[PDB]
Amino acid sequence: TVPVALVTGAAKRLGRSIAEGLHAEGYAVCLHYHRSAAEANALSATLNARRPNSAITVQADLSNVATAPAPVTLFTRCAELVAACYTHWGRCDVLVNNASSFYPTPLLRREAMETATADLFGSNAIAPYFLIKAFAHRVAGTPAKHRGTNYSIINMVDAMTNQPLLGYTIYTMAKGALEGLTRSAALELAPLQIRVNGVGPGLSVLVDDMPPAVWEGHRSKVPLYQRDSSAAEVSDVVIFLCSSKAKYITGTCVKVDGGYSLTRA
Amino acid sequence: TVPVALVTGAAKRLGRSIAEGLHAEGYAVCLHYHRSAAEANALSATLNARRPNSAITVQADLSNVATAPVTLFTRCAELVAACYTHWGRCDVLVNNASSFYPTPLLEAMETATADLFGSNAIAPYFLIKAFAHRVAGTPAKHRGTNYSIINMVDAMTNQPLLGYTIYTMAKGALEGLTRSAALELAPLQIRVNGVGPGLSVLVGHRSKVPLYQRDSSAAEVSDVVIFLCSSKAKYITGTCVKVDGGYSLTRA
Amino acid sequence: VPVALVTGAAKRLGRSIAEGLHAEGYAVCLHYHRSAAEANALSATLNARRPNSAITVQADLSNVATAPAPVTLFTRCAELVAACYTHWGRCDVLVNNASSFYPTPLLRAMETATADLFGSNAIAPYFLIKAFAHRVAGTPAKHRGTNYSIINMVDAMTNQPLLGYTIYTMAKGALEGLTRSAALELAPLQIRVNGVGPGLSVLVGHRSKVPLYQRDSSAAEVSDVVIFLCSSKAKYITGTCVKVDGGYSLTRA
Amino acid sequence: TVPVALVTGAAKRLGRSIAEGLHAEGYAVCLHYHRSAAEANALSATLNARRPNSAITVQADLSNVATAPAPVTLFTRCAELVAACYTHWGRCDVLVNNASSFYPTPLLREAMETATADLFGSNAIAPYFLIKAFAHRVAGTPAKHRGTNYSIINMVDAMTNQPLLGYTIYTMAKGALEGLTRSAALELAPLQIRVNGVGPGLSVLVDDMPPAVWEGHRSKVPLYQRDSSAAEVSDVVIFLCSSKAKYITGTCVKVDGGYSLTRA
Ligand SMILES: NC(=O)C1=CN([C@@H]2O[C@H](COP(=O)(O)OP(=O)(O)OC[C@H]3O[C@@H](n4cnc5c(N)ncnc54)[C@H](OP(=O)(O)O)[C@@H]3O)[C@@H](O)[C@H]2O)C=CC1
Ligand SMILES: NC(=O)C1=CN([C@@H]2O[C@H](COP(=O)(O)OP(=O)(O)OC[C@H]3O[C@@H](n4cnc5c(N)ncnc54)[C@H](OP(=O)(O)O)[C@@H]3O)[C@@H](O)[C@H]2O)C=CC1
Ligand SMILES: NC(=O)C1=CN([C@@H]2O[C@H](COP(=O)(O)OP(=O)(O)OC[C@H]3O[C@@H](n4cnc5c(N)ncnc54)[C@H](OP(=O)(O)O)[C@@H]3O)[C@@H](O)[C@H]2O)C=CC1
Ligand SMILES: NC(=O)C1=CN([C@@H]2O[C@H](COP(=O)(O)OP(=O)(O)OC[C@H]3O[C@@H](n4cnc5c(N)ncnc54)[C@H](OP(=O)(O)O)[C@@H]3O)[C@@H](O)[C@H]2O)C=CC1
Ligand SMILES: Nc1nc(=O)c2nc(CNc3ccc(C(=O)N[C@@H](CCC(=O)O)C(=O)O)cc3)cnc2[nH]1
Ligand SMILES: Nc1nc(=O)c2nc(CNc3ccc(C(=O)N[C@@H](CCC(=O)O)C(=O)O)cc3)cnc2[nH]1
Ligand SMILES: Nc1nc(=O)c2nc(CNc3ccc(C(=O)N[C@@H](CCC(=O)O)C(=O)O)cc3)cnc2[nH]1
Ligand SMILES: Nc1nc(=O)c2nc(CNc3ccc(C(=O)N[C@@H](CCC(=O)O)C(=O)O)cc3)cnc2[nH]1
């Protein structure tokens, strides 16, 4: 009783929605955040008000860089994130790799390039690798009698992977590595009954820092409804794949994109 | 309003689990069968004992062959028409009925072509077209709010079962139907998706399944079909969901 | 001198495939349905360059019976492959290129379209591959050729359906399934089976959307790829589809 | 006057066959290497004996680490590889991202961080900085003086959907390399730079194991029941670089004898 979910980047948008949907199914939730301390503490208050000691927050930079209090490597920051679930609640049944940087890295016209690469690949790919390693190590270190009955890892990927967004090469590479992680971890962790799946949004909760015609033009291209998704239209799929009814699904990436990946220029 | 689901090959195995699953969600279900009349009728009796007027059975050969002439198109149209005649609506279509047997490359090949392609591909196309036409012909204020078509595909499509070429071709066509009808029917808010089992309710290779080293139960597949029809899945369309316990991840 | 059977060979990509294969030394069997004049003019051209290097054979590849007991699509397909063995004693390459292509809208006569689009694009390739494979298996091992290749012309844009073309889109997906299934099952006979998928090629606006060059392709930009896949240098390639689309499948709306 | 190709990891096996195959078509080849200096210099001597001034060798660690000086970054090392082509021959027309470390990183059980940097560097990040450096030098060339057939080939993996057990970082990096292939092909199409992939299945399998075990692996390939020769892969790379392939971009060609069609 009281399964525990770890959701990275849980403070806002899709990750907040995922944490809420998991909390609504009875999970205690560990809300990871990087820079959004206010929103993460506000969400924690809301969920703890519904159920005392059902949400906590942990801060971590998931870029592939070392930090300071010897320097602290990304891998041990990820190990410590999983550790916060077992320390507080004695378990971790669900891990959602949701946190993600996303900005252009154009090929056509150096501290920027160096920090872009660690940031985008760490957050979207390498920290997921380390977190899965930490999550799976902990299941392995748990006596079988004490293991949970429904371990589930979700990687937030991208429905539009075969149709790249112009000028976003590092991001697209990182989401491709994340799909590779989904398949590889699914295979390798199957004997522990840890399922690993991907959920791929198309356009979801689209930021509108552009002229109104440009924003409406973007959304209008989604065949189903001619709009971007809501946060829940994505997070409800995450919550299903973690549910026990999804127990035979692993290594699978589910598009939640309104048909947008079906389109062509 | 009680929504209606048409499930083909509903009498046994996955199709029965899909009919039972939608019925537990509150659907009235049209149970299509070909030869399993006794089984279909017994399933209908069970579901109607639970909720009166919640199940009917209809029979039809979904092979691509003229019947006694009645064409496959006409038989598929009448199947959708059965739902509208009995309940005035059809909200969900599950294209589950499917013949499966070898057509090795190295009149019985023409019977196999019409049977394997009809059930797995050509009948689903007519059924989808009939479902779409009835929705379009319905005044927009009287339309339902959660239209959903599920095609039962094959998670192992990229890894062909040796000797099953026509079956594999037909399931590849059904994936093409999924994508094309999802695109074209999006303006009517009809979602079109696939669910692809791996090894399920085998009647060996099951020890090779990475997750649990067994074929799936019926519910482990039908529970997914039910979710994709749920309104929580209403932004998913044009997508095929593998339910294979990772079997498609394997190699020889 | 090896032999290629090319369906729908009279014009456009099929004619360029036949020309490309012929230029590598192949004798070519030029299949046609309605374009008898174009097929026979092409045959005249290739035979003038190399005597007895081309023939032509007519067949409706729709999944329908034709009159002389009615003749089924299966039989007409068997007779296309037999035409190569009768005339030249071999058939080393089969290019499944013939294809009907027109709308079959789901929204806003259909038995004919089903038989025609699914026949040419999927069921006839299935029957032709079976006939082609039977003839190789029936050939004594010492007398088989050393480079059997089957090429199915598919569609680069298959994951991105063209609005209103459901039957065509379904048929090309069946054809990709046939490519994978036939490649696995015919591998012991060393018969390779691959696909080539154009995007927009030799169109009769949308051109500007192609990332590479902002144009549809020429016929040779496709047929050269077919020709390489049939070459001995490509002998380890089977069961795979090669996109030749200028990057169009990378685009989104 | 003579087109120039930069082949990473050119000293042995597939990279050497790719170098030989492009050289046979008339390319001058820059042969990159990391540890195999003897093998690289032997190959360059062979190519130069066949055709004077048709090969050079360059060393670089393509791991995502800083190297010995102010430290030298991976990007800098990557730009200097491409610049070596322009310094010596004035041009760089083809890039083959072939260099690749390959060993397990099991999920269950400094050498952790160096393996990530090495597997992710060789297979994904160094490809990226090499593609950018290559693209930058083309963009900087006046259109009057640009080459007419720019081609980038990424060596991917036909078995990407069917992961090798215990090889998670490798599998991830190749998945990233496929993303690079698609993204670079779209962004560099305006400069007529094509970007494609070639994915071997089992090629030139090392036989440092029991014979029965090596024959057992090989026998799983449906076509010929063997791993491929080096030329059976490199000939495809050379075709994709040819002008006959000039409408192909953004595409990954499996050269796997049907292995990806198999299941357990
Ligand atoms: N929304 C969409 O349209 C699409 C989304 N996706 C994927 O879905 C997931 C969520 O989408 P969305 O909710 O829009 O994602 P956001 O862009 O809102 O970012 C989510 C969180 O990622 C965290 N984050 C970013 N960089 C780092 C870092 N270097 N270290 C640690 N945390 C970091 C931030 O946490 P903080 O605020 O605490 O700094 C941010 O709140 C992502 O994986 C995204 O890639 C994929 C395709 C489309
Ligand atoms: N079970 C598995 O492991 C897998 C299943 N699938 C797919 O999932 C779906 C169901 O799986 P399963 O339950 O095993 O399927 P079955 O093989 O049990 O067949 C299901 C039903 O199809 C109907 N059917 C067959 N041919 C025709 C026809 N010509 N006309 C009309 N109805 C016909 C039969 O109805 P009747 O009995 O009334 O004649 C049969 O009961 C199918 O689409 C199948 O391809 C895909 C991959 C794996
Ligand atoms: N061109 C493009 O942009 C694209 C092409 N493709 C594929 O490339 C291949 C060739 O393309 P293209 O050259 O444009 O094809 P065409 O549309 O020109 O059709 C080629 C030939 O197919 C034959 N054909 C049509 N219906 C039948 C039938 N029922 N029975 C027998 N033969 C028939 C016709 O032969 P006749 O004239 O003798 O009647 C026609 O000349 C096709 O398979 C096509 O699907 C795929 C994607 C894009
Ligand atoms: N062979 C196969 O069966 C398959 C191969 N592939 C891909 O094809 C390509 C070639 O295959 P193969 O020839 O087997 O590859 P190899 O394993 O023989 O490695 C080729 C070269 O990579 C170079 N390399 C490795 N790590 C680094 C590094 N950190 N920095 C710089 N150079 C490095 C080495 O150069 P040096 O020796 O000079 O140090 C090595 O000779 C690779 O990309 C591989 O992933 C994909 C699937 C199957
Ligand atoms: N981490 C993450 N966060 C996101 O918000 C996100 N969004 C998408 C959805 N795709 C897009 C595409 C374009 C723009 C956008 O705002 N474009 C601006 C500037 C950048 C551009 O050139 O596209 C525009 O004006 O077009 C946003 C989201 C995909 N992955 C993500 N990943
Ligand atoms: N329509 C359909 N029915 C199924 O039962 C089915 N099963 C699978 C799962 N794959 C397989 C693969 C091999 C065998 C098999 O070995 N069959 C036995 C007899 C059972 C049979 O063929 O139905 C055999 O003797 O070959 C069964 C299922 C995939 N698609 C299906 N499709
Ligand atoms: N068998 C086959 N033949 C083809 O020509 C073909 N072409 C494509 C390329 N895609 C397309 C998409 C749209 C139109 C189209 O709508 N044609 C216009 C042309 C009218 C004009 O000349 O302006 C039309 O409406 O007829 C053609 C090709 C794909 N598969 C094919 N398959
Ligand atoms: N860079 C690279 N080099 C390769 O040789 C290579 N080979 C493959 C072909 N796949 C495989 C699969 C398994 C084994 C294997 O069994 N190796 C042993 C150790 C032997 C060794 O790699 O030196 C193993 O323990 O996995 C080798 C190659 C795929 N990618 C590659 N990538």
Author numbering:
A (entry chain B): 5 to 73, 81 to 120, 133 to 288
B (entry chain D): 5 to 72, 82 to 119, 134 to 230, 240 to 288
C (entry chain C): 6 to 73, 81 to 120, 135 to 230, 240 to 288
D (entry chain A): 5 to 73, 81 to 120, 134 to 288
What does the original paper state about this entry?
Contiguous to the substrate-binding pocket, a triad of residues, Asp181–Tyr194–Lys198, form a hydrogen-bond network which has been reported to be crucial for the catalytic process.
We determined the crystal structure of LmPTR1 in complex with folate at 1.81 Å resolution in the orthorhombic space group P212121. The PTR1 macromolecule shows the characteristic homotetramer with 222 point-group symmetry and can be directly compared with all of the available structures reported in the literature. The binding mode of FOL is mainly driven by an aromatic stacking interaction between the bicyclic pterin moiety, the Phe113 side chain and the NADP(H) nicotinamide. The FOL amino group at position 2 is hydrogen-bonded to the Ser111 side-chain hydroxyl (2.8–2.9 Å), the carbonyl at position 4 of the FOL molecule is able to establish water-mediated interactions with the side chain of Arg17, and the N atom at position 8 is within hydrogen-bonding distance of the hydroxyl group of Tyr194 of the catalytic triad (2.7–2.8 Å). It may be conceivable that the slower kinetics shown by both LmPTR1 and TbPTR1 in reducing folate compared with unconjugated substrates has allowed the initial binding of a folate molecule to the enzyme to be trapped in our crystal structure before the beginning of the catalytic process.
